[PDB]
Every structure is written in C-alpha cells, then in structure tokens.
Design a protein around this ligand. Structure first.
Ligand SMILES: OC[C@H]1O[C@@H](O[C@H]2[C@H](O)[C@@H](O)[C@@H](O)O[C@@H]2CO)[C@H](O)[C@@H](O)[C@H]1O
Ligand SMILES: OC[C@H]1O[C@@H](O[C@H]2[C@H](O)[C@@H](O)[C@@H](O)O[C@@H]2CO)[C@H](O)[C@@H](O)[C@H]1O
Lengths: 132, 132
C-alpha cells in the first residue's frame, strides 16, 4: 500500500493522481484521506471501488461511525485492467475523475483542514501516486 | 487547434489535462488561457514549450504588452515524443504538471473570471483536451 503524510494539510485545489492496475482476482480497494494513523480514525474521504459487489462507495467517518454512503454511477473499474483516478480537493468537495470523465462529486462532511494522511490500499497494483 | 469555451469562466481548482504528441519537426506550441471577446488577446496564461530554442516560457499579456517572462527548469518535451500536461488553476496561481512531476508554478496576474477560452495550438498533435 501507499501511505503518505500531508504534514501541511491539503489546501483548496490539491490534486491526487492515482495510476494502477486492478488485479484479475481483485475484491475491493480504497483511497482514504484521513486525520491520522491511529487505527480507525476520522476519514474526510473513503473512496472504495468494489469489484466483488459491482459498486463504488464514497463515505466519511467520524468518532468511529461511518457516515451516509454515496454510490457513484456504475463501476468505471475492471478486473485485469489499468485505471487513472484524479481526486480534486476544492472548497466544495472532492471531484473524482476516472478515465476521461468526471465520475462523482463528494461534498465535504469534515473540514478539509483535518486531512493529514493519504492511504491507497487493498487489491490494487500501483504504478504511481502523486499529490500536486 | 483546440479551442474550448469556459462559459462560467475558469473556476477555482479547474484541472486542464492536455495529451498529445510533439511532431518530429516541431518549432514551438502553446497553451493559452484567454479572455472571451472576439477582440481580445489578453492571456492570463501563455504556456509556450519551445523546441527550437530549448526553453518553456510562461507569461501573461494585457492590452497588447507581454509581462515579465518566467522560464521553467529545462524542457520536459521532446520532438517525436508524446506528452501529458496538467494545468491546475489554484488559489495561488496555475500549477503546470508535465509527466510525473510538478514543473512550474505561475502566480496569478489576471483575474480568473476573465479567462473564458482555452486554446491549444502551434506545432503539436492533440489526442485529448479535457476540462475537469
Ligand atoms: O460505508 C463504508 C463501509 O462499508 C462497510 O460495509 C457496509 C455496507 O456497505 C452497507 O451496505 C451496510 O451493510 O453496512 C456495512 C457496514 O457499515 C464496510 O465494511 C467498510 O469497510 C466500509 O467500506
Ligand atoms: O513572453 C512570451 C513571448 O515571447 C516572445 O519572444 C520574446 C523572447 O522570449 C525574449 O527573448 C524577448 O527578448 O524577445 C521576444 C519578444 O518578447 C514571443 O515572440 C511571443 O510569441 C511570446 O511567446
């Protein structure tokens, strides 16, 4: 997995670019924007493509409780295939771009100032993760 | 050339992604963010890779006069070779990403609300221009 500290927090217009491959036997993988590395802590964004159940779930987490889930339209990910995700942190929320198209806009639940850590893991084979 | 309107202007954290190829005979190509009037050649951003002089120049233009040029470090473009540029419209300015690295940060001179047209031209072959 990728696990990167953002010590200075993220400021409006941070762009996370994730390039990788979905393994042919993949279940699920995630991109998390978190407050910190203590296990089970706050998540401003939990982005969770699920190949096993044909859905992409967005959510937040506070004080140990998942929020209200959102689902993206369809599944722009395929077993055995590469992908490129952009996550664009503006003042409105997180715009997820997959492939050549905007995929979903997840409006902020937590303050952006609370993100200190990016985590990419699960069933995914990474080419690169960049924070611009 | 590619020419696309930004009907609400360029919004904060707009991401422009430009994929193309530098022809083997290239002189220079440009990405311009311009005002919306037929009359107008004001450029909030003039991004100008120059293979003939081996430099990449950033500048702005207003009322027919170029401002102070900024030069990027080296030239991450090669005749005969494909490229991917991101232009990220931030709070502070335009962040230019080439390949896998942030390349140059051009601080704002013109107001974002005056940018209405993205134009890509010169000696370049485009695969895609996308506004996220
Ligand atoms: O909300 C994200 C979490 O979902 C958890 O599974 C949910 C499931 O999606 C929902 O339909 C319902 O059954 O509640 C489950 C548990 O909260 C995952 O277990 C967890 O990993 C998150 O992805
Ligand atoms: O600032 C962008 C413009 O550069 C012009 O070329 C400059 C050149 O870079 C510099 O050496 C100067 O002293 O002479 C020229 C006049 O500005 C280009 O002609 C113009 O197209 C812009 O790219």
């Amino acid at each position: 997995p990728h696990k990167s500290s953002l010590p200075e927090g993220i400021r409006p217009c941070t762009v996370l670019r994730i390039r990788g491959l979905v393994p042919p036997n993949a279940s699920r993988f995630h991109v998390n924007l978190l407050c910190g590395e203590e296990q089970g802590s706050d998540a401003a964004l939990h982005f969770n493509p699920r190949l096993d159940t044909s859905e992409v779930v967005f959510n937040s987490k506070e004080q140990g409780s998942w929020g209200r889930e959102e689902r993206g339209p369809g599944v722009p990910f395929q077993r055995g295939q590469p992908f490129e995700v952009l996550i664009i942190a503006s003042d409105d929320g997180f715009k997820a771009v997959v492939g050549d198209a905007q995929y979903h806009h997840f409006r902020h639940r937590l303050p952006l100032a609370r993100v200190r850590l990016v985590e990419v893991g699960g069933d995914v084979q990474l080419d690169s993760v960049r924070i611009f």
